[PDB]
Amino acid sequence: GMDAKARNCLLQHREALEKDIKTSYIMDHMISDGFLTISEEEKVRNEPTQQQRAAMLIKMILKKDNDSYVSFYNALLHEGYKDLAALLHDGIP
């Protein structure tokens, strides 16, 4: 569903993302945008640590469409993760 460029960007920067991001905030945006289901939210929330939640959310997004990548970018950007957003800018469709 997603462009290779986007996929690879995510795969390249996932460790950096997994490290810093507060997943619940990003998810709230993505749920608002309608690219993330309550069931998916819960599955992420079921992960014990923030890094494990982040990893799960990214694993999920890698199985979604271009729109979802952008939603993720927008979320990061609106939550002030400007550095991490920049890393994914090059891969945006």
Q: What is the CA radius of gyration of the chain?
A: 12
Cα separations in angstroms, 6 against 24, 28, 57, 74, 87:
22, 21, 15, 14, 11
CATH number of the domain to which 68 belongs:
1.10.533.10
Q: CA–CA separation, 78 vs 11, rounded Å? A: 21
Count the domains in the chain: 1
Range of the domain at 18: 4-89
Residue 23 and residue 54 in contact, taking contact as beta carbons nearer than 8 Å:
yes
> DSSP alpha helices (H): ranges in 1-93?
4-12, 14-20, 23-33, 38-45, 50-61, 66-78, 82-89
What technique solved it? Answer: X-ray
Resolution (angstroms) stands at 2.8
CA angle 57, 61, 11 (to 5 degrees): 90
Residue 35 and residue 67 in contact, taking contact as beta carbons nearer than 8 Å:
yes
